[PDB]
Amino acid sequence: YKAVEALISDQAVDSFETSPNPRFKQIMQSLVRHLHDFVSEVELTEQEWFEGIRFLTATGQKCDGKVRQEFILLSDTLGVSMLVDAINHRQSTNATETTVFGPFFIEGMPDRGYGENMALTDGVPALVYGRVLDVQGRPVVGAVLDVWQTADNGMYSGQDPDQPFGNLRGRYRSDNDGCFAIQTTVPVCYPIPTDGPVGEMLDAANRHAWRPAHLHFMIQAPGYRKLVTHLFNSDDPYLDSDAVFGVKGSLQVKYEDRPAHDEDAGGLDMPYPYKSAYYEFVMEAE
Amino acid sequence: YKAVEALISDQAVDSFETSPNPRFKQIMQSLVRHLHDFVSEVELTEQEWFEGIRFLTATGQKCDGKVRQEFILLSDTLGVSMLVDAINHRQSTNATETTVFGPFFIEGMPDRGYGENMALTDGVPALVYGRVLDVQGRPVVGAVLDVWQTADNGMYSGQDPDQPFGNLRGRYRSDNDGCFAIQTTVPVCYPIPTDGPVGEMLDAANRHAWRPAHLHFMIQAPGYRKLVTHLFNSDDPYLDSDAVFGVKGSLQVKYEDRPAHDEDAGGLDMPYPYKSAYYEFVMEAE
Ligand SMILES: CCCCCCCCCCCCCCCCC(=O)O[C@H](COC(=O)CCCCCCCCCCCC)COP(=O)(O)OCC[N+](C)(C)C
Numbered sequence: 001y002k003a004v005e006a007l008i009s010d011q012a013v014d015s016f017e018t019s020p021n022p023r024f025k026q027i028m029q030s031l032v033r034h035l036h037d038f039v040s041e042v043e044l045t046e047q048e049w050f051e052g053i054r055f056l057t058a059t060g061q062k063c064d065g066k067v068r069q070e071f072i073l074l075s076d077t078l079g080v081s082m083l084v085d086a087i088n089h090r091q092s093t094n095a096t097e098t099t100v101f102g103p104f105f106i107e108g109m110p111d112r113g114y115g116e117n118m119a120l121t122d123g124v125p126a127l128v129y130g131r132v133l134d135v136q137g138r139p140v141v142g143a144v145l146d147v148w149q150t151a152d153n154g155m156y157s158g159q160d161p162d163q164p165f166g167n168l169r170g171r172y173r174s175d176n177d178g179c180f181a182i183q184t185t186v187p188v189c190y191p192i193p194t195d196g197p198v199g200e201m202l203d204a205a206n207r208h209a210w211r212p213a214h215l216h217f218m219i220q221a222p223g224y225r226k227l228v229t230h231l232f233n234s235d236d237p238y239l240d241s242d243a244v245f246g247v248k249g250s251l252q253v254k255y256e257d258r259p260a261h262d263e264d265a266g267g268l269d270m271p272y273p274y275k276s277a278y279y280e281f282v283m284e285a286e
Numbered sequence: 287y288k289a290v291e292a293l294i295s296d297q298a299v300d301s302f303e304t305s306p307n308p309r310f311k312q313i314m315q316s317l318v319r320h321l322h323d324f325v326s327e328v329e330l331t332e333q334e335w336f337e338g339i340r341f342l343t344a345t346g347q348k349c350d351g352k353v354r355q356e357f358i359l360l361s362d363t364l365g366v367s368m369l370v371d372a373i374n375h376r377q378s379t380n381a382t383e384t385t386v387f388g389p390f391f392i393e394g395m396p397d398r399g400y401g402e403n404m405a406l407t408d409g410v411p412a413l414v415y416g417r418v419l420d421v422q423g424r425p426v427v428g429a430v431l432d433v434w435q436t437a438d439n440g441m442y443s444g445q446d447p448d449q450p451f452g453n454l455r456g457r458y459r460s461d462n463d464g465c466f467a468i469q470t471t472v473p474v475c476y477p478i479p480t481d482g483p484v485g486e487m488l489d490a491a492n493r494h495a496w497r498p499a500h501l502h503f504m505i506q507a508p509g510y511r512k513l514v515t516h517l518f519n520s521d522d523p524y525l526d527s528d529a530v531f532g533v534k535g536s537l538q539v540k541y542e543d544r545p546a547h548d549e550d551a552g553g554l555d556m557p558y559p560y561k562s563a564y565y566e567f568v569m570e571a572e
Pocket residue numbers: 048049050051052053055071072074075078080200201203204306307309310313317321339342361366
């Protein structure tokens with residue numbers, strides 16, 4: 001006070017001087033200084049400290065071997081996961097912006113044909129179509145687009161093991177002109193889990209637990225850097241308030257109402273009036 | 287980048303604007319800004335983030351219902367517990383400096399007489415004696431000093447349930463001249479638990495897990511603020527490198543070698559040559 005308090009923080013930071021790995025040293029000295037500056041800034045009480053301890057403990061304890069990672073959910077809801085993803089995917093070009101994966105990608109889904117339907121359940125029919133291009137605006141041929149989205153129930157198959165195998169998942173490909181087309185249902189918004197400590201924090205914050213409606217993409221092609229991103233429905237009431245801060249301006253796409261037999265359907269002939277979202281992905285060379 | 291990254295952190299901080307409790311708002315906005323400044327400063331990689339996630343998870347999972355709180359141990363070893371204790375016990379007077387309790391205090395220990403021995407086990411005999419005074423240097427009469435220390439094995443009774451009930455614990459009292467006297471054994475240094483994630487972090491840091499030798503005091507008297515502190519052996523080889531940063535300059539006390547029948551033994555007549563530590567505690571009025 002203020003020498004006494006400063007001396008405790010110096011010793012804590014200095015304790016790491018000896019780490020053989022200088023990156024680990026770097027990280028721990030930074031983390032300790034920030035942690036101690038936080039505690040000092042707010043003048044954390046002992047009772048508040050006990051709350052932080054009970055909360056962290058409960059968050060770790062909510063992590064099971066299996067289907068629930070509450071620490072990741074805490075990282076997501078405090079914006080750390082999206083910050084980390086941006087830092088590691090910095091871009092100066094017009095390449096499509098990235099996002100986290102989320103926890104819901106599944107390996108070994110069906111390779112689907114151009115315009116193939118992946119919606120095996122009820123929903124509002126949609127055609128999601130567009131191109132995969134390079135930064136010069138030329139088509140990337142044979143790119144692979146792995147896509148996944150929740151059902152109407154706000155569950156991914158088989159996060160929800162009751163949905164059919166491969167439902168609302170598929171691996172599609174861009175054609176000779178870089179065009180792709182996916183038949184699906186309009187994605188719907190869904191809440192993140194709130195039955196753990198993260199739900200308590202969101203409740204105390206008066207924050208809702210919703211994600212805006214989205215479609216997940218992972219796009220790969222020889223010569224290009226892997227792209228993992230989301231396309232978010234333009235109209236979604238949660239676009240400005242994504243619980244995990246996934247939304248970026250350029251990843252929004254409008255689901256337009258189109259006439260039956262619209263001529264601008266990537267060569268498909270749609271039998272009824274339908275919803276359509278058009279998007280051009282831009283990939284970075286490697 | 288750098289707008290993109292700044293926008294994610296702003297949204298994460300701003301998400302808490304709505305908290306009904308403005309203290310909770312204050313704390314969470316500060317914590318989020320510090321957390322995001324840390325991640326940005328070091329440019330944390332995705333693999334490092336996964337390590338932080340695995341580590342936090344493992345720390346929470348190491349907490350049992352019962353005898354082990356790994357999050358508290360992490361708070362201690364990163365200097366957060368001592369920082370919190372200082373912030374909440376700020377003093378401008380010559381009052382004795384405070385420390386954390388530690389996890390080892392036990393209720394209902396024996397009320398011991400002046401100079402009573404609390405060492406029921408093997409060790410080097412010591413007389414710890416002194417006074418409890420006010421800030422004006424006058425004796426505090428009938429103060430109660432709850433004291434506890436590890437055995438030679440580096441365990442507290444019955445953290446180590448094999449030691450006798452009350453071993454190296456007692457509740458002593460200051461007399462009409464504020465004098466107290468405690469017979470015990472010279473405290474020995476002991477390591478903190480390293481079989482969990484904190485041990486891994488200390489290993490990576492090339493930090494040892496030792497505490498310098500100490501005696502724990504909690505002193506209470508009517509009219510005065512409760513004092514919880516440690517007296518650390520002056521000669522200890524870990525005094526400058528306490529794993530949990532407990533040591534302060536003024537809490538060190540010399541265990542001097544004294545002659546049999548020394549006249550400066552608080553009125554006790556010690557039968558053999560012995561170790562002696564003299565300390566004057568200064569309590570704050572309430
Ligand atoms: C993986 C990356 C992330 C890791 C980063 C590590 C740390 C980040 C995680 C910390 C999150 C802690 C959030 C705790 C939630 C607090 C809470 O839920 O209860 C609220 C009241 O409690 C509080 O106000 C105290 C909050 C204390 C927070 C201290 C955290 C400090 C961490 C350091 C501690 C040790 C290292 C309820 O509000 P109230 O009920 O009073 O609000 C009033 C409104 N009502 C009554 C109508 C509800």
